[PDB]
C-alpha cells in the first residue's frame, strides 16, 4: 500500500514531457480493469511486466537511469510482500503496449502515452 504510492511517485517523477504535446498519440490499450483474493498472481504478473517494459535498452534510453533503479527496487519490494486466464490477459495487454511502442519508433510522445497509461493501470491494480 505504501510501496504502491512510492511506485506512482517515481513514475510521475520519471515524466519528461507533458502529454498535452502528445494528444494525437493517444491510444486505447484496453486494460482489463475488473481483474482487481486470487489477486496475488495477477498483481505479481503486472509488476513483472512493468519491470520487463521499463528494463529494456529502449527504456534505458528514454528514462533517467537513477529513477529507473529506484523504480525497479520499488517494484521488487512489492513482489517481496506478495511472496491462468487473468495472467494471459495481462500479458496480452503488455504486448499491445510493446507493439504500440515499436510502431511509434519509441518516440518521446509514445513513451509519455505509455508512462501515463501505466500510471492509470498500476493505480487501478493496486486500488
Amino acid at each position, epitope marked *: 500500500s505504501l510501496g504502491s504510492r512510492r511506485t506512482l511517485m517515481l513514475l*510521475a517523477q520519471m*515524466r519528461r514531457i*507533458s*502529454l*498535452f*504535446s*502528445c*494528444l*494525437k*498519440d*493517444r*491510444h*486505447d490499450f*484496453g486494460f482489463p*480493469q475488473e481483474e482487481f483474493a486470487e489477486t496475488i498472481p495477477v498483481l505479481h504478473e503486472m509488476i513483472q511486466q512493468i519491470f520487463n517494459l521499463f528494463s529494456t535498452k529502449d527504456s534505458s534510453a528514454a528514462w533517467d537511469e537513477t529513477l529507473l533503479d529506484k523504480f525497479y527496487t520499488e517494484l521488487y519490494q512489492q513482489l517481496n510482500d506478495l511472496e491462468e486466464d487473468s495472467i494471459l490477459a495481462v500479458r496480452k495487454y503488455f504486448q499491445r503496449i510493446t507493439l504500440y511502442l515499436k510502431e511509434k519508433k519509441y518516440s518521446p510522445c509514445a513513451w*509519455e*502515452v505509455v508512462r*501515463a*497509461e501505466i*500510471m*492509470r493501470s498500476f493505480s487501478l491494480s493496486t486500488n
Partner: single-chain antibody
Amino acid sequence: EVQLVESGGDLVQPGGSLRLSCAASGFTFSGYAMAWVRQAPGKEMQWVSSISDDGGTSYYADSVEGRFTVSRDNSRSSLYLQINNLRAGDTAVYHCARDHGGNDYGDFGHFDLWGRGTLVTVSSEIVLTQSPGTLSLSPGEGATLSCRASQRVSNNYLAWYQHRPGQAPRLLIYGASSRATGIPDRFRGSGSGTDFTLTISRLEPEDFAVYFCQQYGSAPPWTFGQGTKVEIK
C-alpha cells in the same frame, strides 16, 4: 468568484471573420491549458480548439482546421479564437474553458471552469447518447441519467457537467466517478466501457439544469452527449 468571460461574438456575413476573446480572472491563467467549445442551437456541445499553457501547442477540430486560430496572452490573462471563412454551421454560443487535466496522469481534454459564452450568428468520432431527453421530477426525488458511447471510453475518461440557466457550465464528475472539488455527495458517477451513469440522489431546486456528458479518453476530438434536461414539478 473565479470566472471566464467571453466577448467578440456578433452578427457576421458568410465568408466573414470575428475575433473571440476570453478574459480569465481569479486564477493564474498561464498555468493552464485552455479550450473553446461551441454549441449550435438544438445541438450538443462541440470541442473546437485547445491550446497549451505556454501557447506552443494547439489542436483544432477537423471542420475548423485552417479557418480558426487559437492564441493566448498570458501576461493579460486572455485566450483568443480568430474565426474566419464563416458558414451557417459556425452559428453557436462559443465558450472558453479551463483544462482540468494534469501532467502526472496526462488526463487533458476535460474542463473545470467555463464561461457563459458569446453568440456568433452567421447571417444566412465517438458518439455519446444520453437518455432520457427530459426528466420531470419534484424536489427531494432521485434521478438516473445515462450516457452511452458508440465505442469504449479509454481510461474511463468520462466527465459530467451541469448547465443551470443563467450560469456557466460546471464540472461535476471526471474519470467517470471522481467528484470535482466542491461538488456535493448527492452527485454520483459510475460506469465503464460504453455505459456511464450520473445518479442525483436528492434533487434540490438548483439541481434543475441540463446535464451533459463528455468522453476525453481519445485523441482529439473530445466529444459530448446531447444532454438530459432535468426540470422541476
